[PDB]
Design a binder for this molecule. Structure first.
Ligand SMILES: Nc1nc2c(ncn2[C@@H]2O[C@H](COP(=O)(O)OP(=O)(O)O)[C@@H](O)[C@H]2O)c(=O)[nH]1
Ligand SMILES: *[C@@H]1O[C@H](CO)[C@@H](O)[C@H](O)[C@H]1NC(C)=O
Length: 429
């Protein structure tokens, strides 16, 4: 008995926050399947006016090794109705002294009812990834606190037993179960980039960066399930920088360097590491990149992927990430999920952690907070130290971060909390 899980996320969320939510939902599907449910994940079209296949960005065969996945267009070809939408929203009273995992159907909080409308008894209209003719047979809001496992529980609740296809909107509401542990990393590891994108990126490395997998020692097994831990990747003879600006300048100024600050940082790293080539991934306008270059030493060369051909903006972004990921040394931007996904690529490729978890400091704070070191994992008073805080659950609006610790109750009292939670807010949506 096939069942289908569809999802969407807050309209304002970017590509790389959406990549993280995929992992949350993919782990819900994993749990569902481990418990005997034949669930298939339907991949949501990439949109903000467009409705683009996952193939353009990712290797489906890789994704399919973790859980069964289909494109949304394939799902439509089966002529199956969407039986139920579950919207997903917070508990209006907010979380308490413990972060209780729970869910409950509740009246819809905004903007739910401005985004879905009952036009016939079994016809609820909504965005549905820009597809005008798609609709749901049923609709409701559910307040939820919890994780991939909690979502599993919700989807198995008797209230939805008659549905075969269910769409969970505002999926960013859900947290990772076991953040940074095996299954989190299996989901991350399965998101191999599309071969065509990897080919284009490798052509650039060869032609401009004196870089290929052979010399860089960055060759990865074709089948991600066979990856093993290593810290022996060298990378091409270049420095990678993700330079996040645009909106970050107008919601995030105090923790970013200026143009001269950035120049200084790059010059210093290049001297320390004997590198003369820099790969720059940035969203900044040409002028700003031009002013950066003009502040650098004449010996240093700055490269960017700009011969983009017929490639769409998301493909270009992936290419920038892959190129940063293969540098001898990487430095990224504060709280950017585009940067977070690069750090994860480096973990997978097998670089030393020193070369990966680095962030550009603001001009007046050279000992600024550096990113949390969530390292790749392949295997599964007496309190441990607290873990790092997780990345914010949301890239815009209010979200959640947590940190955890453990204690052996058999040989110690182990009093007090093993989890802390706090609100985070990266920028406005
Ligand atoms: N090509 C390219 N695009 C970028 C870069 N940095 C930001 N962007 C664009 O801006 C978006 C920012 O949203 P997201 O990926 O969620 O990352 P975040 O806002 O940095 O957390 C990215 O998806 C890209 O479309 C970059 O270095 N290269
Ligand atoms: C299931 O549906 C009924 C309304 O028909 C509702 O009372 C109940 O709260 C729902 N259960 C959950 C756990 O959301």
């Amino acid at each position: 008995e096939k069942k289908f899980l569809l999802y969407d996320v807050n309209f304002g969320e970017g590509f790389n926050l959406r990549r993280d939510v995929y992992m949350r939902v993919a782990n819900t599907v994993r749990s569902l399947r481990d418990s005997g449910e034949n669930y298939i994940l339907v991949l949501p079209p990439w949109g903000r006016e467009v409705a683009l296949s996952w193939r353009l960005f990712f290797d489906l065969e890789s994704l399919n090794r973790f859980i069964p996945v289909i494109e949304f267009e394939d799902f439509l070809d089966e002529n199956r109705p969407i039986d139920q939408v579950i919207y997903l929203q917070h508990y209006a009273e907010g979380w308490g002294t413990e972060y209780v995992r729970k869910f409950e159907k509740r009246s819809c909080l905004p903007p739910a009812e401005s985004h879905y409308k009952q036009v016939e008894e079994f016809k609820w209209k909504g965005w549905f990834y820009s597809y005008e003719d798609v609709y749901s047979r049923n609709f409701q809001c559910v307040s939820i606190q919890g994780d991939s496992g909690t979502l599993k529980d919700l989807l198995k609740h008797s209230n939805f037993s008659e549905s075969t296809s269910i769409m969970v909107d505002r999926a960013e509401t859900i947290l990772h179960e076991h953040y940074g542990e095996v299954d989190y990393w299996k989901a991350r590891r399965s998101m191999r980039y599309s071969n065509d994108l990897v080919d284009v990126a490798d052509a650039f490395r060869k032609k401009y960066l004196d870089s290929d997998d052979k010399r860089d020692k960055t060759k990865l097994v074709d089948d991600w399930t066979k990856e093993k831990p290593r810290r022996t990747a060298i990378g091409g003879p270049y420095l990678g920088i993700h330079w996040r600006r645009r909106d970050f300048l107008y919601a995030k100024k105090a923790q970013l360097p200026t143009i001269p600050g950035t120049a200084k940082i790059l010059q210093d790293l290049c001297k320390k590491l004997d590198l003369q080539k820099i790969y720059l991934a940035t969203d900044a306008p040409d002028q700003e990149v031009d002013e950066l270059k003009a502040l650098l030493n004449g010996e240093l060369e700055v490269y960017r992927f700009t011969d983009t051909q017929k490639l769409n903006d998301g493909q270009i972004a992936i290419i920038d990430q892959y190129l940063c990921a293969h540098a001898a040394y990487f430095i990224g931007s504060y709280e950017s999920t585009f940067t977070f996904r690069i750090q994860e690529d480096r973990e997978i490729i097998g670089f030393p952690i020193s070369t990966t978890f680095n962030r550009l400091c603001p001009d007046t704070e050279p000992t600024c907070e550096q990113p949390a070191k969530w390292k790749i994992v392949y295997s599964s008073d007496g309190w441990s130290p607290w873990s790092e805080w997780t990345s914010c659950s949301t890239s815009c609006g209010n979200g959640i971060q947590q940190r955890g610790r453990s204690c052996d109750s058999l040989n110690n009292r182990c009093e007090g909390s093993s989890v802390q939670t706090r609100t985070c807010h990266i920028q406005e949506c």
